[PDB]
Amino acid sequence: FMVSLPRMVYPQPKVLTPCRKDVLVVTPWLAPIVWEGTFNIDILNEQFRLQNTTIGLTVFAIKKYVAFLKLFLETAEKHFMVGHRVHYYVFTDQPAAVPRVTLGTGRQLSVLEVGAYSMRRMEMISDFCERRFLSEVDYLVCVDVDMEFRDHVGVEILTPLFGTLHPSFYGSSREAFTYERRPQSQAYIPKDEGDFYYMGAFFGGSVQEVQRLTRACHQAMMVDQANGIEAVWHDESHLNKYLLRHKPTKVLSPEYLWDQQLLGWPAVLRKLRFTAVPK
Amino acid sequence: FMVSLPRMVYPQPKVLTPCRKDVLVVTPWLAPIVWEGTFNIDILNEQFRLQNTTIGLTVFAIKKYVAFLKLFLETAEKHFMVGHRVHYYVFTDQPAAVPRVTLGTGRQLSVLEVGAYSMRRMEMISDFCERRFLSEVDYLVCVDVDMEFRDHVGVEILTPLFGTLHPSFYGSSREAFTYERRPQSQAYIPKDEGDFYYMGAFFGGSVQEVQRLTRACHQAMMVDQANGIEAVWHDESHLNKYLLRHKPTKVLSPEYLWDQQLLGWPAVLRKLRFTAVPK
Numbered sequence: 001f002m003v004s005l006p007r008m009v010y011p012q013p014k015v016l017t018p019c020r021k022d023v024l025v026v027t028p029w030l031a032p033i034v035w036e037g038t039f040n041i042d043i044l045n046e047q048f049r050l051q052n053t054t055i056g057l058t059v060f061a062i063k064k065y066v067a068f069l070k071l072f073l074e075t076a077e078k079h080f081m082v083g084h085r086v087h088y089y090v091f092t093d094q095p096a097a098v099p100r101v102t103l104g105t106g107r108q109l110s111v112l113e114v115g116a117y118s119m120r121r122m123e124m125i126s127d128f129c130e131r132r133f134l135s136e137v138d139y140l141v142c143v144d145v146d147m148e149f150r151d152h153v154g155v156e157i158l159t160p161l162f163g164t165l166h167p168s169f170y171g172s173s174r175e176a177f178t179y180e181r182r183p184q185s186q187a188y189i190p191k192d193e194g195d196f197y198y199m200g201a202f203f204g205g206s207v208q209e210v211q212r213l214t215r216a217c218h219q220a221m222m223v224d225q226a227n228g229i230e231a232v233w234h235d236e237s238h239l240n241k242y243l244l245r246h247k248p249t250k251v252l253s254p255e256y257l258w259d260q261q262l263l264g265w266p267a268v269l270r271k272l273r274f275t276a277v278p279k
Numbered sequence: 280f281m282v283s284l285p286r287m288v289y290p291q292p293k294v295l296t297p298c299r300k301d302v303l304v305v306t307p308w309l310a311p312i313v314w315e316g317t318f319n320i321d322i323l324n325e326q327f328r329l330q331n332t333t334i335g336l337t338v339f340a341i342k343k344y345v346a347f348l349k350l351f352l353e354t355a356e357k358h359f360m361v362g363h364r365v366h367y368y369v370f371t372d373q374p375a376a377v378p379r380v381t382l383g384t385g386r387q388l389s390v391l392e393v394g395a396y397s398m399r400r401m402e403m404i405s406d407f408c409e410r411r412f413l414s415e416v417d418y419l420v421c422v423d424v425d426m427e428f429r430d431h432v433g434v435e436i437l438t439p440l441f442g443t444l445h446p447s448f449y450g451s452s453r454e455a456f457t458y459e460r461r462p463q464s465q466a467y468i469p470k471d472e473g474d475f476y477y478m479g480a481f482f483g484g485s486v487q488e489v490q491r492l493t494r495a496c497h498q499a500m501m502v503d504q505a506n507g508i509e510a511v512w513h514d515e516s517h518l519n520k521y522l523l524r525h526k527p528t529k530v531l532s533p534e535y536l537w538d539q540q541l542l543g544w545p546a547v548l549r550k551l552r553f554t555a556v557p558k
């Protein structure tokens with residue numbers, strides 16, 4: 001049950017004025033594509049706070065990648081779901097190397113140890129952590145660690161299932177997408193199929209939908225392994241196959257996954273929110 | 280659980296090409312605004328058929344308005360949810376005056392008799408028919424009868440909660456909206472609030488959300504009656520108050536509720552789907 005919003009004063013949306021004329025802001029299956037200027041964060045914050053929403057964030061820091069945690073977490077504290085309940089789940093082979101990061105109120109961090117080792121992340125999120133997540137959070141956000149938050153990443157992303165447009169391919173035609181092209185792989189997508197090329201570095205949704213996605217990808221990856229084939233971009237290839245056949249209910253623009261060193265700051269990006277760190 | 284979509288061949292959505300540049304296609308709370316050119320109906324039909332979706336349509340034909348049923352129903356057969364399961368619920372004081380309309384396969388019609396008499400419709404939909412609808416349909420669409428379908432009205436509208444932009448006010452600023460302006464009414468909206476002016480003639484959603492809306496509006500109307508006040512536009516005033524405080528998850532453009540005699544055929548309308556009949 002959703003309680004009433006309070007009175008709010010904000011600019012009237014005008015039907016004969018688009019928010020953005022330079023970009024596609026809705027997919028052909030009526031999922032919003034999230035760009036700056038398409039959302040009033042005050043309305044969304046109200047909606048999600050009234051439901052006491054808890055967001056889980058998963059991040060893996062195995063071997064040398066523990067070095068990325070300090071900046072990742074400190075910048076998440078500045079920019080990720082501020083004002084909402086957040087539970088970080090840090091998966092690592094070196095619990096002692098997790099930096100002690102000071103958290104805002106209503107935010108917690110759990111260190112989950114994994115064995116020293118694509119397959120792990122999908123497997124961990126689905127198989128081992130299924131019951132944990134269902135009991136503890138409403139939404140799960142699953143990201144790469146070699147990243148930093150530079151600007152707002154908030155409840156505008158939340159939805160049953162989302163993927164993020166890969167920053168190198170948002171202007172590409174589908175035949176150029178680096179999907180798995182061998183019919184022998186479960187991740188196979190022919191050249192006349194595909195909506196978008198989604199990056200494996202940032203996906204999420206409700207706990208139920210994320211567990212469905214990660215279970216399906218893990219099962220498909222096991223089939224490929226049994227058949228002696230490894231998809232060209234590993235987990236990302238399977239994620240793309242899944243999101244082709246199970247359309248996401250929001251799509252995040254490349255504001256949410258950018259590499260400024262590689263790609264600069266094009267006119268179409270009003271904000272660079274979550275960005276690659278040198279590695 | 281949602282099964283996989285089959286392989287489909289359709290045009291690739293292009294991120295740097297908007298579907299429509301002349302209109303707002305998403306609200307500030309990230310609800311799609313449904314216009315022609317924003318949706319691929321083949322994808323949506325697949326999604327909804329894979330769930331074996333059943334759509335209920337409610338229509339009231341009391342006193343002289345039974346005359347509108349023949350055209351309403353015959354044109355619904357041509358244009359409304361064709362290929363999907365449909366259950367019409369015709370509420371009338373004259374069951375014998377309901378025309379015998381030939382239905383396509385997978386479509387049924389129930390005649391519900393009501394006593395000879397705003398309050399009735401919200402009351403009937405919520406109070407009397409609650410259990411019926413929950414058992415029989417997935418979505419409810421609630422419309423006026425003095426109307427005809429001229430073009431496709433399909434599963435693109437389906438969502439937990441929708442309203443429809445009133446055709447006379449989609450270009451108006453909020454201070455001009457004919458909301459109830461007396462603070463003594465439950466339907467009161469001050470001049471600095473409001474997103475859109477929604478028409479009472481076409482709303483819907485999941486059965487649960489429609490029952491919530493109609494219950495809330497009926498309760499608010501009873502409060503007003505007890506206080507000796509009748510909102511300026513009756514049920515429509517209350518519907519507007521509800522949708523201000525409970526944001527719809529889709530908004531239908533005025534393609535879905537048009538009066539051509541009054542308003543012609545402006546450039547912004549590529550299709551006139553559901554239109555007023557002279558009365």
Ligand SMILES: O=c1ccn([C@@H]2O[C@H](COP(=O)(O)OP(=O)(O)O[C@H]3O[C@H](CO)[C@@H](O)[C@H](O)[C@H]3O)[C@@H](O)[C@H]2O)c(=O)[nH]1
Pocket residue numbers: 059060061062063064065118143144145146199200201202233234235236
């Ligand atoms: O030794 C390692 C290697 C990887 N990781 C984790 O795995 C993530 C992915 O590896 P990374 O080296 O960041 O791969 P990238 O080349 O930056 O990213 C590509 O490969 C990833 C893994 O397949 C996908 O998530 C991305 O979408 C795709 O762009 C890292 O961020 C870490 O969270 C570790 O923890 N330790």
Ligand SMILES: O=c1ccn([C@@H]2O[C@H](COP(=O)(O)OP(=O)(O)O[C@H]3O[C@H](CO)[C@@H](O)[C@H](O)[C@H]3O)[C@@H](O)[C@H]2O)c(=O)[nH]1
Pocket residue numbers: 338339340341342343344397422423424425478479480481512513514515
């Ligand atoms: O004697 C009547 C009068 C009304 N109705 C039903 O009620 C509906 C609404 O009445 P109508 O005469 O169509 O009102 P309109 O002036 O066309 O519509 C305005 O009033 C309606 C009722 O308040 C709202 O649904 C609309 O949004 C608003 O534009 C009709 O279509 C019928 O379904 C009857 O069945 N018999």
Ligand SMILES: [Mn+2]
Pocket residue numbers: 144145146201
């Ligand atoms: Mn990375």
Ligand SMILES: [Mn+2]
Pocket residue numbers: 423424425480
């Ligand atoms: Mn009418």
